[PDB]
Design a protein around this ligand. Sequence first.
Ligand SMILES: NC(=O)c1ccc[n+]([C@@H]2O[C@H](COP(=O)([O-])OP(=O)(O)OC[C@H]3O[C@@H](n4cnc5c(N)ncnc54)[C@H](OP(=O)(O)O)[C@@H]3O)[C@@H](O)[C@H]2O)c1
Ligand SMILES: CC[C@@H](C(=O)O)c1ccc(-c2ccc(C)c(F)c2)c(C(F)(F)F)c1
Length: 319
Amino acid sequence: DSKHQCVKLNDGHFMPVLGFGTYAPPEVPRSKALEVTKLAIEAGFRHIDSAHLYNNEEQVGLAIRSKIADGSVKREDIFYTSKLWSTFHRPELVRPALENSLKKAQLDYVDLYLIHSPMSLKPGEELSPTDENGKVIFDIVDLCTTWEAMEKCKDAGLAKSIGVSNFNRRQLEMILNKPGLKYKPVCNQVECHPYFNRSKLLDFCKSKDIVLVAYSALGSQRDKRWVDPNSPVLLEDPVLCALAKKHKRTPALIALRYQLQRGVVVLAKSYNEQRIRQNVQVFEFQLTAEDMKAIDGLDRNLHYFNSDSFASHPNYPYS
Ligand SMILES: NC(=O)c1ccc[n+]([C@@H]2O[C@H](COP(=O)([O-])OP(=O)(O)OC[C@H]3O[C@@H](n4cnc5c(N)ncnc54)[C@H](OP(=O)(O)O)[C@@H]3O)[C@@H](O)[C@H]2O)c1
Ligand SMILES: CC[C@@H](C(=O)O)c1ccc(-c2ccc(C)c(F)c2)c(C(F)(F)F)c1
């Protein structure tokens, strides 16, 4: 089926080009992640994006287990992604972090394990370690050694594929130029949308056989902790809205289809049954070449996540 279209990764594995985003803010009860991940699988999502940080791998794993038990899907039909959180970058912490995620989700392996971010944080139990003055505490880790620990996780069969997230070109090149590299990252999961389309990074990744995976492809959830309320709302963009009317679709569907036609694997978060099912209709239509150029013109270099807690980190990927 067209809905189960995949891209071949540089390690031979396959990744579905449309993925379900599972992050919800901590004020959303965890029971919802369980309910909506089941809804996503029912609608035809097979790529599910989670992370230790999201405090939901148990619920996402329960949803997968439930849909396997009622015969909707086999484990082999699901592409499950987890992410190493930034307090676990030190190489001796990597494999135990992955094994803990597997235990929470009650899975035997992940299809994809990512370094969540290059911005290392102080090791410990707290996900957001902070000093007496409230500032998040940074750590300094050679991410090449983190990657070597990820490579051992793939060789152990705990992760079918490994990749990175929120890396810029310089940080990617550091991994790719590493002496004795065994596995290249299969992907780089980054913020990517018509207001921040990452064409330069996309061209770099294409030249290296690295898939760019787009998050916040619908403009982010605009969480007040990190998103400026005065930033423009992506789905209210006049060009996207006119394209939605011309195609008799929605602005969200235009934004998702834009990514598929430029070779980007796209994530979409929804906790609403009707929008979850609408988002799978991205395979039903096509943007013209002129439509694509129009959307290409919307780039504003706008990353919705903006905070001096990020920007002061030595490994902050933007500039
Ligand atoms: N690697 C990283 O650092 C990183 C960072 C950010 C995100 N991610 C991952 O990418 C996923 C998606 O990114 P995101 O969380 O920023 O959200 P997003 O995909 O950009 O979606 C933002 C909002 O769009 C709404 N939406 C979904 N479908 C819609 C539709 N058809 N029409 C209108 N609105 C629609 C959703 O609200 P409703 O729920 O109300 O439908 C959602 O809250 C995340 O959940 C996470 O899995 C990863
Ligand atoms: C809270 C949602 C969560 C998710 O859904 O993954 C998320 C969202 C954005 C970022 C983020 C922000 C700024 C910069 C520069 C970055 F590189 C990554 C992170 C990260 F990586 F910092 F943890 C995590």
